[PDB]
């Protein structure tokens, strides 16, 4: 959730006065230019197993509207006794 | 005393033939104090620049009368010439910037005091002296409320003509199929009655191959009706008028376009505030070509579908919107300030005036004044 | 600017200068203060209602449960009535089915006082069920917009657009860095894009709006700036997370200059303090950037009501099959 | 149409009494309406003295 | 704070200091940076009838 | 907690006053200090502080 804040980047750390800074930076730039970084991203960080979108409104489940069935069951249980008494009288 | 024309605070009306204000009484049954202030006509002087007297009254006049009674001194009220509040600007002559309006008149000595809704800001606080604010207020925006109309087309809106035609074909198809499966007008009547729920006909499809079709048709009709009702309800709910500005930070105000027009009164505190801002250059540039010469004129223009928004003091806009029933103040107050009495530096009235203002605020005299001249909310 | 810096006529260059493998052997770049790359901009969509939305309000448990309950109620009513055409088991089911669906189809009333109470209770249940279904369907009609985004220069829509619906017709401005990068990386895409060359960036937006184009490939920063100030917010970029050949805007400095370390430290300090976000808030953010998808519920079409028609056709076919048997 | 319009009209919001403040009949004449308005302040202060 | 200012032990008093007719004969106040007074606080009402 | 309370508008306030800075009875600093405060009302820093 939210928008990215404190934009930064990942880099290779080295000690000062190390004879690898320029070559490492040039190699990183070349990899960016020639699409090696894109291939690496598509190989390791690339997955859409379960996407997301605007969730639909909730649907009424059995427990959400389990009152009408109980009311009708009570009505039928009362009606059986009513018919029994009517036949008996 | 130099005063300006502000409806909530300074009412200006023509005098009678004999040269006296018409007698008037308030609701409680008390006279309304009035004074004779000599000033030009409502419009610009121009050729007929005769200064015909026009006695004025209002909340500011009552405050001035109270101040005069508290400390023994006589007054002589008059209106300003240019009809502006005051600002610093250059002239076509050598570059010697000078004030105009009430501020210029006070500085030039033509007036000894200012009694009017004058805001307190740093620009004009370096030349004159202000007393304690006798009314705290801010800056607000006034717009015209839109009538809540319904933009609904004919009843056919929820369903496109193709769907209507398909339903019409389908009803006939089901009727004919049921008639054929029976072995007729009876099938068509039954289908129409089921679809429209009219209870016409006595069709009895005893065939076991037609009861299922009839049940399916009834379910389809119920589903269609429910879908139509739900779509109509959803469309009606989501049909609302466009939102208002709702504050000065509205993106619409940030980006000025010919579609939306907003301005204020030329040579006022609002103009200085907008010009001094560094992040509001676009708004100031847009408003520079639409500012009006008076508050009443701007109110009338906004009322008659000519101005979209008017930025002005809250104390005046609230009163205006409480007696029109068609104007509304939108947004939150910004640039909070107060109204004070302006005077020249080194005058023997500043301390006494400030003490009198504080005493009036504490005792409750100010309140009364607000109730008498303000707080008329009827909308 | 690069020539001026190299020619010693200036010490630093401030502006929208890109960093790349070349152009660095003659000038030293500082830490970038803004990201950029090769992104794709496409027009926004709205979306409609699902064909099966007419079954969304109730779960399947509900429909089957109500079916079984109706069968049980019909059987109980028949048994109670058992204690010319007085009543039948096959007619009670028809009457109950008609009652459930707004009670439109003609039915035959029972001839028993006891059965009348059961019929009334079933009618009450049916009215409650219909009201609940209508309310849920009305609630479901509130549909928001959906952003049909793409992975970006890595999906079949760009690699093989000729094996699906009419091609996306993605295009870019030729004779530029982006075209060279596309040619060097993906020859097939560059060859295919030759039929959608756009002269300028101003006309690209008009072409996309009209419908002549479906995707514009260009620099990320320029595309974001243009999208921010759209007259209707109908254009949206692909996103910062999916950008090809990412780079940044930097400050050109003289080679082996002692100010490079201080400049980079100052830029990093500005990033840490939070001044960059404030600057982008007023200089880069457009009219509409932090906006959701408008609901703007639309009407119903044949595609929207496809499920109901399919169910009706299936029921008709089943009826015909039963008649044949 | 009637059902749809009624459903649309069923949406309601909150409202404020919008009392003038120490100048309306609620505070001046509490007995006209339900006398027990139950409004008070903190004693031994500037507000009570005022 | 008012006593400290009067007693010459301080030059200014910064805080939530209210301006009034009294207390002004011994010290001089500046332009107020915040407004206040007497106000009424009440709960909210549903109002859905 | 819960945002169940509310207060009347600033316009409907009785015995309005303000918060100030106490200074010596006779001192030129005030003449400048006031201006400084007014400056804060022009640049808009008061709104941000609030
Ligand atoms: O590095 C630069 O010089 C500028 C120029 N860029 C335009 C790129 C044009 P194309 O991608 O080659 O078609 C925009 C910002 N960077
Ligand atoms: O007077 C002051 O210096 C302070 C004290 N105030 C408290 C007022 C409490 P009550 O209303 O009189 O009971 C708050 C700010 N001003
Ligand atoms: C860095 O690269 C240069 C060629 O660009 C090479 O001569 C040098 O040996 C490299 N440095 C190291 C430490 O390998």
UniProtKB/Swiss-Prot annotation, chain B:
Known outcome of mutating residue 223 to T: In NDHMSD; uncertain significance; changed glutamate-gated calcium ion channel activity; mutant channels are activated at 2-fold higher glutamate and glycine concentrations
Effect caused by changing residue 222 to V: In NDHMSD; likely pathogenic
Phenotype when changing residue 218 to V: In NDHMSD; uncertain significance; may affect glutamate-gated calcium ion channel activity; decreased sensitivity to magnesium block
PTM field: NMDA is probably regulated by C-terminal phosphorylation of an isoform of GRIN1 by PKC. Its phosphorylated state is influenced by the formation of the NMDAR-PPP2CB complex and the NMDAR channel activity.
Renumbered residue ranges of the record's region Pore-forming: 184-205
Cytoplasmic side: 197-208
Extracellular side: 230-379
Intramembrane segments: 186-196
Sorted UniProt keywords: Calcium, Cell membrane, Disease variant, Disulfide bond, Epilepsy, Glycoprotein, Intellectual disability, Ion channel, Ion transport, Ligand-gated ion channel, Magnesium, Membrane, Metal-binding, Phosphoprotein, Postsynaptic cell membrane, Receptor, Signal, Synapse, Transmembrane, Transmembrane helix, Transport, Zinc
Effect on the protein of changing residue 243 to K: In NDHMSD; this mutation produces a significant increase in NMDA receptor-induced calcium currents; excessive calcium influx through NMDA receptor could lead to excitotoxic neuronal cell damage
One GO-annotated biological process of the protein: excitatory postsynaptic potential
An example molecular function term from Gene Ontology annotations: NMDA glutamate receptor activity
Residues given in the record as glycine binding sites: 117, 119, 124, 269, 313
Disulfides per UniProt: 21-55, 37-56, 325-379
Note on domains (UniProt): A hydrophobic region that gives rise to the prediction of a transmembrane span does not cross the membrane, but is part of a discontinuously helical region that dips into the membrane and is probably part of the pore and of the selectivity filter.
Subunit structure and binding partners: Heterotetramer; the NMDAR subunits are modular and harbor tiered domains that function in concert to regulate opening and closing of the cation-selective ion channel pore. Forms heterotetrameric channels composed of two GluN1/zeta subunits (GRIN1), and two identical GluN2/epsilon subunits (GRIN2A, GRIN2B, GRIN2C or GRIN2D) or GluN3 subunits (GRIN3A or GRIN3B) (in vitro). Can also form heterotetrameric channels that contain at least two GluN1 subunits and at least two different GluN2 subunits (or a combination of one GluN2 and one GluN3 subunits) (in vitro).
Protein name: Glutamate receptor ionotropic, NMDA 1
Organism of origin: Homo sapiens (Human)
Swiss-Prot record, chain E:
Residues annotated to bind L-glutamate: 18, 23
Cell compartment(s), UniProt: Cell membrane; Postsynaptic cell membrane; Cell projection, Dendrite; Late endosome
Domain of life assignment: Eukaryota
PTM note: Phosphorylated on tyrosine residues.
Reported tissue expression: Primarily found in the fronto-parieto-temporal cortex and hippocampus pyramidal cells, lower expression in the basal ganglia.
Glycosylation sites noted in the Swiss-Prot or TrEMBL record: 46
Family note: Belongs to the glutamate-gated ion channel (TC 1.A.10.1) family. NR2B/GRIN2B subfamily.
Disorder this protein is connected to according to its UniProt record: Intellectual developmental disorder, autosomal dominant 6, with or without seizures: A disorder characterized by significantly below average general intellectual functioning associated with impairments in adaptive behavior and manifested during the developmental period. MRD6 additional features may include seizures, hypotonia, abnormal movements, such as dystonia, and autistic features.
Function according to Swiss-Prot or TrEMBL: Component of N-methyl-D-aspartate (NMDA) receptors (NMDARs) that function as heterotetrameric, ligand-gated cation channels with high calcium permeability and voltage-dependent block by Mg(2+). Participates in synaptic plasticity for learning and memory formation by contributing to the long-term depression (LTD) of hippocampus membrane currents. Channel activation requires binding of the neurotransmitter L-glutamate to the GluN2 subunit, glycine or D-serine binding to the GluN1 subunit, plus membrane depolarization to eliminate channel inhibition by Mg(2+).
Quaternary context: Heterotetramer. Forms heterotetrameric channels composed of two GluN1/zeta subunits (GRIN1), and two identical GluN2/epsilon subunits (GRIN2A, GRIN2B, GRIN2C or GRIN2D) or GluN3 subunits (GRIN3A or GRIN3B) (in vitro). Can also form heterotetrameric channels that contain at least two GluN1 subunits and at least two different GluN2 subunits (or a combination of one GluN2 and one GluN3 subunits) (in vitro). In vivo, the subunit composition may depend on the expression levels of the different subunits. Found in a complex with GRIN1 and GRIN3B. Found in a complex with GRIN1, GRIN3A and PPP2CB.
Swiss-Prot/TrEMBL domain comment: The extracellular N-terminal domain (NTD) endows NMDARs with a unique capacity for allosteric modulation, harboring several binding sites for small molecule ligands that act as subunit-specific allosteric modulators of ion channel activity. A hydrophobic region that gives rise to the prediction of a transmembrane span does not cross the membrane, but is part of a discontinuously helical region that dips into the membrane and is probably part of the pore and of the selectivity filter.
UniProt-recorded name of the protein: Glutamate receptor ionotropic, NMDA 2B
Organism in which the protein naturally occurs: Homo sapiens
């Amino acid at each position: 959730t939210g928008e990215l804040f404190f934009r930064s980047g990942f880099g290779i750390g080295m000690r000062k006065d190390s004879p690898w800074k320029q070559n490492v930076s040039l190699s990183i730039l070349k990899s960016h230019e020639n699409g090696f970084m894109e291939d690496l991203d598509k190989t390791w960080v690339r997955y859409q197993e379960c996407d997301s979108r605007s969730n639909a409104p909730a649907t009424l489940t059995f427990e959400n509207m389990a009152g009408v069935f109980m009311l009708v069951a009570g009505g039928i249980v009362a009606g059986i006794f009513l018919i029994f008494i009517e036949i008996a009288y | 005393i130099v005063t300006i024309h502000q409806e909530p605070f300074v009412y200006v009306k023509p005098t009678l033939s004999d040269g006296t204000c018409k007698e008037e009484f308030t609701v409680n049954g008390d006279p309304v104090k009035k004074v004779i202030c000599t000033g030009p006509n409502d419009t610009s002087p121009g050729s007929p620049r005769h200064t015909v007297p026009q006695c004025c009254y209002g909340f500011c006049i009552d405050l001035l009368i109270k101040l005069a009674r508290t400390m023994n001194f006589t007054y002589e009220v008059h209106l300003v010439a240019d009809g502006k509040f005051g600002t610093q600007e250059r002239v076509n002559n050598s570059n010697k910037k000078e004030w105009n309006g009430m501020m210029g008149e006070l500085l030039s000595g033509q007036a000894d005091m200012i009694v009017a809704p004058l805001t307190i800001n740093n620009e004009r606080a370096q030349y004159i002296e202000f007393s304690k604010p006798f009314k705290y207020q801010g800056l607000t925006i006034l717009v015209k409320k839109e009538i809540p109309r319904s933009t609904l087309d004919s009843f056919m809106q929820p369903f496109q003509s193709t769907l209507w035609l398909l339903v019409g074909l389908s009803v006939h198809v089901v009727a004919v199929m049921l008639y054929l499966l029976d072995r007729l007008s009876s099938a068509m009547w039954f289908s129409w009655g089921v679809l429209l729920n009219s209870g016409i006909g006595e069709g009895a499809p005893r065939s076991f191959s037609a009861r299922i079709l009839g049940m399916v048709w009834a379910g389809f009709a119920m589903i269609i009706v429910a879908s139509y009702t739900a779509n109509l309800a959803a469309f009606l709910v989501l049909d609302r008028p466009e939102e208002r500005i709702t504050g000065i930070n509205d993106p619409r105000l940030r980006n000025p376009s010919d579609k939306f027009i907003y301005a204020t009164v030329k040579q006022s505190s609002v103009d200085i505030y907008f010009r001094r801002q560094v992040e509001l250059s676009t708004m100031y540039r847009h408003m520079e070509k639409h500012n009006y010469e008076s508050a009443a004129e701007a109110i009338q223009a906004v009322r008659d579908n000519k101005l979209h928004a008017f930025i002005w003091d809250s104390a005046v806009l609230e009163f205006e919107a409480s007696q029109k029933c068609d104007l509304v103040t939108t947004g939150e107050l910004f640039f909070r300030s107060g109204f004070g009495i302006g005077m020249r530096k080194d005058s023997p009235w500043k301390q006494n005036v400030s003490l009198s203002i504080l005493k009036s605020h504490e005792n409750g005299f100010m309140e009364d004044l607000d109730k008498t001249w303000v707080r008329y909310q009827e909308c | 600017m690069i020539g001026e810096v190299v020619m010693k006529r200036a010490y630093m260059a401030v502006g929208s200068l890109t960093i790349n493998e070349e152009r660095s052997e003659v000038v030293d770049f500082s830490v970038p203060f803004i990201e950029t790359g090769i992104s794709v901009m496409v027009s926004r969509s709205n979306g409609t209602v699902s064909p099966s939305a007419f079954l969304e309000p109730f779960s399947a448990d509900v429909w089957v449960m109500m079916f079984v309950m109706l069968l049980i109620v019909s059987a109980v009513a028949v048994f109670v009535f058992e204690y010319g055409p007085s009543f039948t088991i096959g007619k009670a089911i028809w009457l109950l089915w008609g009652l459930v669906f707004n009670n439109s189809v003609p039915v035959q009333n029972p001839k028993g006082t006891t059965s009348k109470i059961m019929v009334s209770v079933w009618a009450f249940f049916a009215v409650i069920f219909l009201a609940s279904y209508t309310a849920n369907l009305a609630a479901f009609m509130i549909q928001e917009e959906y952003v049909d985004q793409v992975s970006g220069l890595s999906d079949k829509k760009f690699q093989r657009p000729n094996d699906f619906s009419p091609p996306f017709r993605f295009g870019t401005v030729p004779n530029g860095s982006t075209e060279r990068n596309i040619r060097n990386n993906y020859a097939e895409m560059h060859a295919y894009m030759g039929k959608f060359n756009q002269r300028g960036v101003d006309d690209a937006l008009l072409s996309l709006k009209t419908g002549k184009l479906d995707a514009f490939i260009y620099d990320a920063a320029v595309l974001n700036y243009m999208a921010g100030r759209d007259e209707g917010c109908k254009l949206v970029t692909i996103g910062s997370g999916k950008v090809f050949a990412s780079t940044g805007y930097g400050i050109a400095i003289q080679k082996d200059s002692g100010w490079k370390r201080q400049v980079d430290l100052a830029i990093l300090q500005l990033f840490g303090d939070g001044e960059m976000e404030e600057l982008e808030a007023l200089w880069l953010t457009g009219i509409c950037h932090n906006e959701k998808n408008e609901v703007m519920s639309s009407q119903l079409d044949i595609d929207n009501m496809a499920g109901v028609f399919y169910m009706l056709g299936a029921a008709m076919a089943l009826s015909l099959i039963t008649f044949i048997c």
